[PDB]
Design a protein around this nucleic acid. Structure first.
Ligand SMILES: [Mg+2]
Ligand SMILES: [Mg+2]
Ligand SMILES: [Mg+2]
Ligand SMILES: [Mg+2]
Lengths: 386, 63, 136, 225
RNA sequence: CAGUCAAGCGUUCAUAGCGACAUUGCUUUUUGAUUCUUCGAUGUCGGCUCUUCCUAUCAUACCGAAGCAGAAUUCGGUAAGCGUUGGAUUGUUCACCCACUAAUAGGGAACGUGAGCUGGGUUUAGACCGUCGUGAGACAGGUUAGUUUUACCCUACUGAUGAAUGUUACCGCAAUAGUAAUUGAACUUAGUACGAGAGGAACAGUUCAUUCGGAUAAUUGGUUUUUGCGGCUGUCUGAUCA
RNA sequence: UCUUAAGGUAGCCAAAUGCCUCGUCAUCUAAUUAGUGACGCGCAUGAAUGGAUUAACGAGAUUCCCACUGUCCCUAUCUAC
RNA sequence: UGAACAGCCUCUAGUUGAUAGAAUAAUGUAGAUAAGGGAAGUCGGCAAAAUAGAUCCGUAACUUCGGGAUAAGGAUUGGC
């Protein structure tokens, strides 16, 4: 018989299966659409999620009740050291899809990127790309034939880049390596840009700028095996229920005589790769700069790092992206920040944002002070200070 | 922005921090945290709580 | 709310479900209002329709004057006592739940309001702001 | 003229506007007709300031105004205070009030010479009113209505009071204020006359539902002809 | 539940909307009829929970017709994408009221769903009343009390590894499978179009909100074996400290 | 007036006894097939088949109110096994 | 300690027996806490919460005059 009262379906069927991701670095399944008129630029960037804080800014929405009034918003910080370009690859297009045909690497590869090609680095002869560098140090013979091959073929050019993990407070020492699409100029201009930028660093302000709406691609925080009540949000069974109550009561009818795929069941929660779109950049900070946390209104020389550092992460000595709201993934996780796939006007994506004040109090408790100078000025002298 | 003062302890309140409480006699109190808020709800006198600005002002400690 | 709204309202954390009894702040002779409905509330299985500050509700006078008891009338919530966030991010709350009586167009049955009212209610209903003593 | 105006449908103009002889204040979230009424009737001689008081569109009930001075609540922000200081002429004085009742338009009914206040205001606020506005103050209720600003409309020429007001209270208040007072209604019988309309020496603005006998009572008592 | 014909109703006018006397069908969510399967047992009410399907569409999208001036409404088409509620009484399905809402549409899946629950009802043994009976006893008459067992197997489903593709490592492609957003209010248009008046729209624009989903923990709240700090009771270590 | 052995008296009632029935009126609630108070041509109440009333008592059955709360809105967290 | 062969701790005496080790997923069993609301849940307040000792004040209808009654409802409590 029919269901007595209608109710919406628990959970989203388009995020199935809720399994663990294949890697800890989420894959960029789509890049922004190319046009061969703009200069040669990357479509995305890599960073490490550091943590969240608050800002105060003056809202500019002509018609809202909070027009020209101060609001406090939550932002999250992504530590972005300059990425190192080692390698390019070209993709021809077949009736079975895109297919890579060659890969041309840089000459000198650092230890932190060539640690990616090892599971046991400490017991190794470190022989990686040695015969490839021996293919180099001729005039050009085995090199520009592959480069002219990518020019002659290969309708899509992607650049192999790797992070500088040693510039971050993470204890990993093994960099992350990825492919980023180039979206400017012709194929020859793309591969000429890559050849000029082998063994060179690309900063985050070369690809991003303020008031830009971007996407965050990351693997979410893992939670292990989870029951159906928190994994899917189903209603808790009543108190006098024998054999437990964090369950789904009916898992299917008599016919069809099988459990359906659409029935909510227990399993892994979290550690899924997600792509969250439309996050506005509030600040592209420079690590070679004091007063990162200062605005034009605050004007007190303080860095973006809070008191006592970011909890479980550390310091923000490199460049960073301040982006509005929440992004998937927890702290210390690799995250890929991507340009928007479409042009959004919306009278919200076009809003110019100027910050007033950035919170730098401690996140390891109810912090009262933004700077140690302010803490010392408020509390006076102590016994430990003579 | 404006930095307000704690109604119980005199600590400085930054934007979006703590709570506010409007009593029935139309008086506004601002609490920097749940500790001072709970002491206010427990009706403790801030003149007798040793870490408050009003206590240190009364007892001439660091003044 | 619905019909007599003067503008829109941001989402306030809902604190008064169906069956809640709040104090009756005005001078109409009623002592408490018992909430039986919230105007503009949606539909979900098992979910109680809950009210926030500035909302218009349907209420009965459980305790008060006999010509006000035993009938349903519209009311407006002016004090919430469940903490909610503003867009300037202060979390604030009163110490009691309180509302006033009105017609469906929103003008007050009474004439004066005792105690504070919220600015999110005073901006949305002008008669409440007219008879209100203090607006916070 | 008692000018028919609505605030986006609202027939209460005293809630959303504050009119004195020297200046006018209007809410920022207003319609073209609502602004055009004050712009056409007031002209270029008198400044009209689009303002927000304490983050609220309601400004008439939040503030109490005079030709010599303006009183604002404590919750008024520094940006709004600076904007009012720049937009207003140098003659008027703007001073924040630190007082519990905090809704000065409801609390205070005032004109150029004499003012009626809520009985339970603080003495520092009474002295602040007497200093900034230069106005002598009486603590009185209009037939038991403590909100004298909401329940009275007052100008230099005359005053409109609450309809359900005792006659003895009418001559008492008339002798106390040295102006003639009429009990009457505004906005098709709404009791709150001060919230219903704003008035000064040569202009009164009221809601569209204010009927013709009510408008005639307004122009008679305020001598706008 | 749907047709065909059209005497009439509809001021006039069969068919805008209806439609008598007749007549052709469809459906198996009614109840019958039958006794084919099951009596070395297929757990027979209702509710709660949860998924999917049907369309004979209540709402939402786009349209056609009117006895469509506007507003409101009615008839019909493509349409099952998306939603279809909170309560008082009753064990109920049903019903009947209160109220919100865009709307509170109808149904199926062994009259979905008891090794998922519950046990109010029915349907054992105790007991009371009324009627019937000489009596033992009877009563889809009323009332009260009455044990709800087992999964560790196979499949299915949800997640998790994994031999073999010379070895190992990194970066990728995308066959196929799944998929998601939803609805409302206010301001303005505008007291405008329309109308004799009463009344009174819509498109574009702006700001919010409802339902759903995916994350996240800067802030607020919750949680405390951080047994982290402080306090307090009783007893024990002679007291103190601890 | 007929009939019978004699025709239900005092009381009580939609009661644990009333099919119709969710009886009718009042009250209780926003709304009550529930509760209470009345009414009585009572299918089929009724006097040791005991009738009516009744303080105190009851792990008896039922209704309402105050207090109280994760029963619920709507779930979250902690400990031991 | 306390009214107390209550509960809690100790002296004499007697045990230290009950397969253990490592981690801390879901669902359980047992024990708990929850903002705002307060029975809207459910057949039904089932279950849990609330109250609690002692002293002083105060205590209704009804009644078989014995009760009801700890009715209801308030205040206080340490140490020196
Ligand atoms: Mg069903
Ligand atoms: Mg259905
Ligand atoms: Mg923290
Ligand atoms: Mg339900």
């Amino acid at each position: 018989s029919h269901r007595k009262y209608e109710a919406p379906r628990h959970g989203h069927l388009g995020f199935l299966p809720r399994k663990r991701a294949a890697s800890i670095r989420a894959r960029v399944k789509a890049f922004p659409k190319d046009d061969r008129s703009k200069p040669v630029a990357l479509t995305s960037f890599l960073g490490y999620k550091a943590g969240m804080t608050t800002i105060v800014r003056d809202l500019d929405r002509p018609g809202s009740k909070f027009h020209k009034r101060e609001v406090v918003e939550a932002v999250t910080v992504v530590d972005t050291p300059p990425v190192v370009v080692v390698g390019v690859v070209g993709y021809v297009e077949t009736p079975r899809g895109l297919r890579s045909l060659t890969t041309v690497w840089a000459e000198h590869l650092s230890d932190e990127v060539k640690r990616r090609f090892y599971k046991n680095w400490y017991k190794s002869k470190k022989k990686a790309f040695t015969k490839y560098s021996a293919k180099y140090a001729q005039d050009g013979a085995g090199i520009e034939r592959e480069l002219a091959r990518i020019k002659k073929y290969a309708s899509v050019v992607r650049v192999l880049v790797h992070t500088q993990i040693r510039k971050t407070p993470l204890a990993q020492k093994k960099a992350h390596l990825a492919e980023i699409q180039l979206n400017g100029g012709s194929i020859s201009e793309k591969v000429d840009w890559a050849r000029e930028h082998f063994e060179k660093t690309v900063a985050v302000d070369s690809v991003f700028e303020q008031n830009e709406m971007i996407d965050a691609i990351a693997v979410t925080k893992g939670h292990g095996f989870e029951g159906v009540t928190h994994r899917w949000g189903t209603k808790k069974l009543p108190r006098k229920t024998h054999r437990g109550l964090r369950k789904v009561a009916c898992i299917g009818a008599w016919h069809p005589a099988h459990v359906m795929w659409s029935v909510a069941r227990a399993g892994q929660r979290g550690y899924h790769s997600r792509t969250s779109i439309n996050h506005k950049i509030y600040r592209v900070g420079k690590g070679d700069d004091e007063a990162n946390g200062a605005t034009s209104f605050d004007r007190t020389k303080k860095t973006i790092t809070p008191m006592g550092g970011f909890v479980h992460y550390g310091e923000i000595k490199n460049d960073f992206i301040m982006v509005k709201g929440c992004i998937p993934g927890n702290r210390k996780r690799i995250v890929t920040l991507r340009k928007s796939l479409y042009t959004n006007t919306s009278r919200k994506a076009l809003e110019e944002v100027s910050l007033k004040w950035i919170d730098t109090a401690s996140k390891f408790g109810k912090g009262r002070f933004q700077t140690p100078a302010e803490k010392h000025a408020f509390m006076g002298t102590l016994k430990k200070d003579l | 922005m404006k930095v307000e003062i704690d109604s119980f302890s005199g600590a400085k309140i930054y934007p979006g921090r703590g709570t506010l409480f409007v009593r029935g006699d139309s008086k506004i109190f601002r609490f920097q945290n749940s500790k001072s808020a709970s002491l206010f709800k427990q009706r403790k006198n801030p003149r007798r709580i040793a870490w408050t600005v009003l206590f240190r002002k009364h007892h001439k400690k660091g003044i | 709310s619905g019909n007599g709204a003067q503008g829109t309202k941001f989402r306030i954390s809902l604190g008064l479900p169906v069956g809640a009894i709040m104090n009756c702040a005005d001078n109409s002779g009623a002592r408490n209002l018992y909430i039986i409905a919230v105007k503009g509330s949606g539909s979900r299985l098992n979910r109680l329709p809950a009210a926030s500050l500035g909302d218009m509700v349907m209420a009965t006078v459980k305790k008060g004057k006999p010509e006000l008891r035993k009938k349903v009338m519209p009311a407006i919530v002016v004090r919430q006592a469940k903490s909610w966030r503003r867009r300037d991010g202060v979390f604030l709350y009163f110490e009691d739940n309180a509302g006033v009586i009105a017609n469906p167009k929103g003008e007050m049955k009474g004439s004066a309001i005792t105690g504070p009212v919220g600015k999110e209610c005073a901006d949305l209903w002008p008669r409440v702001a007219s008879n209100s003593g203090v607006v916070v | 003229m008692a000018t028919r105006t609505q605030f986006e449908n609202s027939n209460e103009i005293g809630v959303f506007s504050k009119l004195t002889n020297t200046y006018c204040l209007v809410a920022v979230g207003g319609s073209e007709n609502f602004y055009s009424a004050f712009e056409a009737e007031l002209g270029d001689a008198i400044p009209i300031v689009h303002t927000t008081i304490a983050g609220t569109r309601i400004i008439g009930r939040m503030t109490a105004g005079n030709r010599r001075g303006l009183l604002v609540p404590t919750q008024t922000t520094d940006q709004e205070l600076q904007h009012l200081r720049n937009s207003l002429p140098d003659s008027v004085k703007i001073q924040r009030v630190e007082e519990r009742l905090s809704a000065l338009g409801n609390v205070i009914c005032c004109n150029d010479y004499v003012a009626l206040v809520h009985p339970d205001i603080d003495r520092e606020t009474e002295e602040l009113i007497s200093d900034v506005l230069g106005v002598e103050v009486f603590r009185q209720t209009i037939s038991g209505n403590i909100l004298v600003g909401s329940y009275c409309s007052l100008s230099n020429q005359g005053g409109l009071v609450h309809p359900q007001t005792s006659v003895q209270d009418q001559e008492e208040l008339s002798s106390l204020l040295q102006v003639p007072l009429v009990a009457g209604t505004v906005n098709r019988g709404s009791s709150v006359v001060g919230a219903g309309m704003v008035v000064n020496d040569y202009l009164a603005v009221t809601g569209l539902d204010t009927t013709a006998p009510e408008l005639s009572v307004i122009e008679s008592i305020f001598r706008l002809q």
